[PDB]
Design a protein around this motif. Structure first.
Motif, PDB file in Angstrom:
ATOM      1  N   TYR A 215       9.968  -7.085  -3.329  1.00  0.00           N
ATOM      2  CA  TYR A 215       9.222  -5.983  -2.746  1.00  0.00           C
ATOM      3  C   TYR A 215       9.316  -6.069  -1.231  1.00  0.00           C
ATOM      4  O   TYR A 215       9.014  -7.102  -0.635  1.00  0.00           O
TER       5      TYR A 215
ATOM      6  N   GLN B 135       5.786  -4.082   3.228  1.00  0.00           N
ATOM      7  CA  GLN B 135       4.386  -4.296   3.584  1.00  0.00           C
ATOM      8  C   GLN B 135       4.074  -5.279   4.714  1.00  0.00           C
ATOM      9  O   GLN B 135       2.923  -5.675   4.898  1.00  0.00           O
ATOM     10  N   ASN B 136       5.095  -5.662   5.475  1.00  0.00           N
ATOM     11  CA  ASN B 136       4.900  -6.526   6.636  1.00  0.00           C
ATOM     12  C   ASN B 136       6.063  -6.334   7.600  1.00  0.00           C
ATOM     13  O   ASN B 136       7.181  -6.771   7.336  1.00  0.00           O
TER      14      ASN B 136
ATOM     15  N   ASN C 240       7.138  -7.782  10.001  1.00  0.00           N
ATOM     16  CA  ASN C 240       7.826  -8.977  10.490  1.00  0.00           C
ATOM     17  C   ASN C 240       8.766  -9.598   9.456  1.00  0.00           C
ATOM     18  O   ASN C 240       9.377 -10.634   9.715  1.00  0.00           O
TER      19      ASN C 240
ATOM     20  N   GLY D 261       0.350   0.440  -5.479  1.00  0.00           N
ATOM     21  CA  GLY D 261       0.115  -0.770  -4.716  1.00  0.00           C
ATOM     22  C   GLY D 261      -1.354  -1.140  -4.735  1.00  0.00           C
ATOM     23  O   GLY D 261      -2.165  -0.441  -5.346  1.00  0.00           O
TER      24      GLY D 261
ATOM     25  N   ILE E 247      -3.491  -1.007  -2.318  1.00  0.00           N
ATOM     26  CA  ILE E 247      -4.320  -0.155  -1.471  1.00  0.00           C
ATOM     27  C   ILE E 247      -3.811   1.284  -1.417  1.00  0.00           C
ATOM     28  O   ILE E 247      -2.636   1.523  -1.140  1.00  0.00           O
TER      29      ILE E 247
ATOM     30  N   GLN F  94       3.447  -8.630 -13.450  1.00  0.00           N
ATOM     31  CA  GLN F  94       2.866  -9.455 -12.399  1.00  0.00           C
ATOM     32  C   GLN F  94       1.974 -10.541 -12.982  1.00  0.00           C
ATOM     33  O   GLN F  94       0.831 -10.289 -13.365  1.00  0.00           O
TER      34      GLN F  94
ATOM     35  N   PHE G 261       0.170 -12.911 -11.763  1.00  0.00           N
ATOM     36  CA  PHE G 261      -0.685 -13.488 -10.726  1.00  0.00           C
ATOM     37  C   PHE G 261      -1.887 -12.583 -10.470  1.00  0.00           C
ATOM     38  O   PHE G 261      -1.884 -11.415 -10.857  1.00  0.00           O
ATOM     39  N   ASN G 262      -2.910 -13.126  -9.817  1.00  0.00           N
ATOM     40  CA  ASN G 262      -4.153 -12.397  -9.574  1.00  0.00           C
ATOM     41  C   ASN G 262      -4.768 -12.025 -10.921  1.00  0.00           C
ATOM     42  O   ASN G 262      -5.492 -11.036 -11.039  1.00  0.00           O
TER      43      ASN G 262
ATOM     44  N   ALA H 129       0.645 -15.245  -0.601  1.00  0.00           N
ATOM     45  CA  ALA H 129       0.999 -13.933  -1.136  1.00  0.00           C
ATOM     46  C   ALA H 129       0.021 -13.363  -2.158  1.00  0.00           C
ATOM     47  O   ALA H 129       0.063 -12.169  -2.454  1.00  0.00           O
ATOM     48  N   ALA H 130      -0.855 -14.201  -2.699  1.00  0.00           N
ATOM     49  CA  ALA H 130      -1.811 -13.736  -3.698  1.00  0.00           C
ATOM     50  C   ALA H 130      -3.083 -14.574  -3.723  1.00  0.00           C
ATOM     51  O   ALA H 130      -3.128 -15.669  -3.163  1.00  0.00           O
ATOM     52  N   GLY H 131      -4.116 -14.047  -4.373  1.00  0.00           N
ATOM     53  CA  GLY H 131      -5.373 -14.768  -4.476  1.00  0.00           C
ATOM     54  C   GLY H 131      -5.219 -16.013  -5.328  1.00  0.00           C
ATOM     55  O   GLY H 131      -5.846 -17.040  -5.058  1.00  0.00           O
TER      56      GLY H 131
ATOM     57  N   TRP I 267       6.679 -11.172  -4.919  1.00  0.00           N
ATOM     58  CA  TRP I 267       5.883 -10.481  -3.921  1.00  0.00           C
ATOM     59  C   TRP I 267       5.565 -11.543  -2.876  1.00  0.00           C
ATOM     60  O   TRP I 267       4.811 -12.474  -3.156  1.00  0.00           O
TER      61      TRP I 267
ATOM     62  N   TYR J 241       6.593 -13.272   2.492  1.00  0.00           N
ATOM     63  CA  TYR J 241       6.186 -14.588   2.020  1.00  0.00           C
ATOM     64  C   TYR J 241       7.336 -15.383   1.421  1.00  0.00           C
ATOM     65  O   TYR J 241       7.280 -16.611   1.346  1.00  0.00           O
TER      66      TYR J 241
HETATM   67  C1  LIG Z   1       3.454  -4.219  -6.895  1.00  0.00           C
HETATM   68  C2  LIG Z   1       2.024  -4.515  -6.471  1.00  0.00           C
HETATM   69  O1  LIG Z   1       1.085  -3.975  -7.056  1.00  0.00           O
HETATM   70  N1  LIG Z   1       1.863  -5.365  -5.461  1.00  0.00           N
HETATM   71  C3  LIG Z   1       0.549  -5.883  -5.122  1.00  0.00           C
HETATM   72  C4  LIG Z   1       0.422  -5.900  -3.586  1.00  0.00           C
HETATM   73  O2  LIG Z   1       0.116  -4.589  -3.136  1.00  0.00           O
HETATM   74  C5  LIG Z   1      -0.645  -6.872  -3.046  1.00  0.00           C
HETATM   75  O3  LIG Z   1      -0.359  -7.158  -1.662  1.00  0.00           O
HETATM   76  C6  LIG Z   1      -1.091  -6.489  -0.698  1.00  0.00           C
HETATM   77  O4  LIG Z   1      -0.611  -5.136  -0.648  1.00  0.00           O
HETATM   78  C7  LIG Z   1      -1.283  -4.337   0.348  1.00  0.00           C
HETATM   79  C8  LIG Z   1      -0.753  -2.918   0.218  1.00  0.00           C
HETATM   80  O5  LIG Z   1      -1.007  -2.386  -1.073  1.00  0.00           O
HETATM   81  C9  LIG Z   1      -1.031  -4.927   1.736  1.00  0.00           C
HETATM   82  O6  LIG Z   1      -1.705  -4.136   2.735  1.00  0.00           O
HETATM   83  C10 LIG Z   1      -0.987  -3.935   3.901  1.00  0.00           C
HETATM   84  O7  LIG Z   1      -1.375  -4.933   4.841  1.00  0.00           O
HETATM   85  C11 LIG Z   1      -0.537  -4.916   6.007  1.00  0.00           C
HETATM   86  C12 LIG Z   1      -0.926  -6.110   6.857  1.00  0.00           C
HETATM   87  O8  LIG Z   1      -2.276  -6.017   7.289  1.00  0.00           O
HETATM   88  C13 LIG Z   1      -0.683  -3.582   6.749  1.00  0.00           C
HETATM   89  O9  LIG Z   1       0.334  -3.524   7.767  1.00  0.00           O
HETATM   90  C14 LIG Z   1      -0.008  -2.962   8.984  1.00  0.00           C
HETATM   91  O10 LIG Z   1       0.089  -1.537   8.855  1.00  0.00           O
HETATM   92  C15 LIG Z   1      -0.290  -0.841  10.063  1.00  0.00           C
HETATM   93  C16 LIG Z   1      -0.200   0.641   9.763  1.00  0.00           C
HETATM   94  O11 LIG Z   1      -1.008   0.989   8.650  1.00  0.00           O
HETATM   95  C17 LIG Z   1       0.613  -1.258  11.238  1.00  0.00           C
HETATM   96  O12 LIG Z   1       0.107  -0.674  12.452  1.00  0.00           O
HETATM   97  C18 LIG Z   1       1.015  -0.012  13.262  1.00  0.00           C
HETATM   98  O13 LIG Z   1       1.691  -0.992  14.067  1.00  0.00           O
HETATM   99  C19 LIG Z   1       2.687  -0.411  14.941  1.00  0.00           C
HETATM  100  C20 LIG Z   1       3.340  -1.556  15.691  1.00  0.00           C
HETATM  101  O14 LIG Z   1       3.817  -2.553  14.799  1.00  0.00           O
HETATM  102  C21 LIG Z   1       2.036   0.600  15.897  1.00  0.00           C
HETATM  103  O15 LIG Z   1       3.039   1.233  16.679  1.00  0.00           O
HETATM  104  C22 LIG Z   1       1.251   1.654  15.110  1.00  0.00           C
HETATM  105  O16 LIG Z   1       0.544   2.492  16.012  1.00  0.00           O
HETATM  106  C23 LIG Z   1       0.264   0.965  14.165  1.00  0.00           C
HETATM  107  N2  LIG Z   1      -0.447   1.942  13.362  1.00  0.00           N
HETATM  108  C24 LIG Z   1      -1.652   1.649  12.878  1.00  0.00           C
HETATM  109  C25 LIG Z   1      -2.265   2.623  11.885  1.00  0.00           C
HETATM  110  O17 LIG Z   1      -2.272   0.634  13.200  1.00  0.00           O
HETATM  111  C26 LIG Z   1       0.637  -2.785  11.388  1.00  0.00           C
HETATM  112  O18 LIG Z   1       1.608  -3.155  12.358  1.00  0.00           O
HETATM  113  C27 LIG Z   1       0.970  -3.447  10.053  1.00  0.00           C
HETATM  114  N3  LIG Z   1       0.904  -4.891  10.180  1.00  0.00           N
HETATM  115  C28 LIG Z   1       1.953  -5.637   9.844  1.00  0.00           C
HETATM  116  C29 LIG Z   1       1.759  -7.146   9.844  1.00  0.00           C
HETATM  117  O19 LIG Z   1       3.049  -5.157   9.540  1.00  0.00           O
HETATM  118  C30 LIG Z   1      -0.516  -2.377   5.800  1.00  0.00           C
HETATM  119  O20 LIG Z   1      -0.982  -1.205   6.452  1.00  0.00           O
HETATM  120  C31 LIG Z   1      -1.271  -2.551   4.472  1.00  0.00           C
HETATM  121  N4  LIG Z   1      -0.821  -1.547   3.525  1.00  0.00           N
HETATM  122  C32 LIG Z   1      -1.627  -0.561   3.139  1.00  0.00           C
HETATM  123  C33 LIG Z   1      -1.059   0.437   2.142  1.00  0.00           C
HETATM  124  O21 LIG Z   1      -2.779  -0.433   3.548  1.00  0.00           O
HETATM  125  C34 LIG Z   1      -1.519  -6.380   1.787  1.00  0.00           C
HETATM  126  O22 LIG Z   1      -1.168  -6.959   3.036  1.00  0.00           O
HETATM  127  C35 LIG Z   1      -0.878  -7.187   0.656  1.00  0.00           C
HETATM  128  N5  LIG Z   1      -1.448  -8.524   0.622  1.00  0.00           N
HETATM  129  C36 LIG Z   1      -0.657  -9.593   0.585  1.00  0.00           C
HETATM  130  C37 LIG Z   1      -1.329 -10.956   0.570  1.00  0.00           C
HETATM  131  O23 LIG Z   1       0.572  -9.519   0.563  1.00  0.00           O
HETATM  132  C38 LIG Z   1      -0.633  -8.188  -3.818  1.00  0.00           C
HETATM  133  C39 LIG Z   1      -1.754  -9.129  -3.428  1.00  0.00           C
HETATM  134  O24 LIG Z   1      -1.553 -10.417  -3.990  1.00  0.00           O
HETATM  135  O25 LIG Z   1      -0.762  -7.927  -5.222  1.00  0.00           O
HETATM  136  C40 LIG Z   1       0.394  -7.274  -5.744  1.00  0.00           C
HETATM  137  O26 LIG Z   1       0.228  -7.152  -7.112  1.00  0.00           O
END
Ligand SMILES: CC(=O)N[C@@H]1[C@@H](O)[C@H](O[C@@H]2O[C@H](CO)[C@@H](O[C@@H]3O[C@H](CO)[C@@H](O[C@@H]4O[C@H](CO)[C@@H](O[C@@H]5O[C@H](CO)[C@@H](O)[C@H](O)[C@H]5NC(C)=O)[C@H](O)[C@H]4NC(C)=O)[C@H](O)[C@H]3NC(C)=O)[C@H](O)[C@H]2NC(C)=O)[C@@H](CO)O[C@H]1O
Length: 273
Positions: free
Chosen positions: A6, A9-10, A12, A80, A82, A181, A183-184, A224-226, A255, A259
């Protein structure tokens, strides 16, 4: 088998092109189109990678094409952890399917979120919200394959079987790849020194639904997960020797890309998959 990853979502975790150039992944799921349905304007979230506004993420088409020429299937992942994604009715499933076709598949749109590239298929990562009409969405999307190019269907249900959201959709038998999946979810994931719950769960998933191939979905690292992380050595020596016996075994899903690099997971298990 192969590894499904996947990406998205990051910011970096590297570009999509770089991700596929690693030569470690056979499938890439772009996460996520976390908003759609109930009249909402579909919206994609790719973390810090790019801002979808004004075609700010159309550059992703270069990564998609780069992956595809390397034989890697790329899917758009719906849902996803969120998002306000949902389906209010069967009509909604039709609208979303038509939207997806014109904006991500062989259809036409002046505002395709990820560019002009044509995705190989759609990935169902439905974890919350509506438990209905996902089977309709799958059916509508699948029918588009009759126009010439197959629209692949993949799913990422959580390990509890049957999945509360994707159970019916998976019963259609229209899914090509299903990465469960494990996990979690304590009842069906790995616990220190205990593989019974995960193997038992694996057996339920591989002796029920009709899908092309079933994959073992895992967290690429403890962060990557809880819960549910499995050390590479345990996976290789205890789990893989068992699940690979199944003729439905397709490989492993991770996922996520971010990570994976941090923990070097796929780098350690790739040859055993
Ligand atoms: C298949 C499946 O079901 N998988 C799941 C899986 O979803 C679970 O993992 C988690 O997923 C969620 C999404 O569903 C992840 O949420 C992420 O979190 C990110 C980190 O905090 C976040 O990224 C940030 O996004 C911002 C925008 O929304 C970025 O900001 C922008 O930055 C720009 C410069 O870089 C700037 O120019 C812009 O102006 C600025 N805009 C804004 C609005 O601020 C920001 O840079 C970015 N950060 C990074 C580090 O990239 C995502 O927004 C967010 N997604 C959503 C949809 O909200 C969550 O991180 C995942 N967690 C983990 C631990 O991976 C997983 C959990 O175990 O379970 C699987 O089953």
């Amino acid at each position: 088998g192969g590894i499904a990853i996947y990406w998205g979502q990051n910011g970096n975790e590297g570009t999509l092109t770089q991700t596929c150039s690693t030569r470690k992944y056979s499938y890439v799921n772009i996460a996520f189109l976390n908003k759609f349905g109930n009249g909402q304007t579909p919206q994609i979230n790719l973390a810090g990678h790019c801002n979808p506004a004004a075609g700010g993420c159309t550059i992703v088409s270069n990564g998609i094409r780069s992956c595809q020429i390397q034989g890697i299937k790329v899917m758009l992942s719906l849902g996803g952890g969120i998002g306000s994604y949902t389906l209010a009715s069967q009509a909604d499933a039709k609208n979303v399917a038509d939207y997806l076709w014109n904006n991500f598949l062989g259809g036409k749109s002046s505002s395709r979120p990820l560019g002009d590239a044509v995705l190989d298929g759609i990935d169902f990562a439905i974890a919350h919200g509506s438990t209905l009409y996902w089977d309709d969405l799958a059916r509508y999307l699948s029918a588009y394959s009759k126009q010439g190019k197959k629209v692949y269907l993949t799913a990422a249900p959580q390990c509890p079987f049957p999945d509360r959201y994707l159970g019916t959709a998976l019963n259609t038998g229209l899914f090509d790849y299903v990465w469960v999946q494990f996990f979690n979810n304590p009842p069906c994931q790995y616990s220190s020194g205990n593989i019974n719950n995960i193997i038992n769960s694996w057996n339920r998933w591989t002796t029920s639904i009709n899908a092309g191939k079933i994959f073992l979905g895992l967290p690429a690292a403890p962060e990557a997960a809880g819960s549910g992380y499995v050390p590479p050595d345990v996976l290789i020596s205890r789990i893989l020797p068992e699940i690979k016996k199944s003729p439905k075994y397709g490989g492993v899903m991770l996922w996520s890309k971010f990570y994976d690099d941090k923990n070097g997971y796929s780098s350690s298990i790739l040859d055993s998959v």
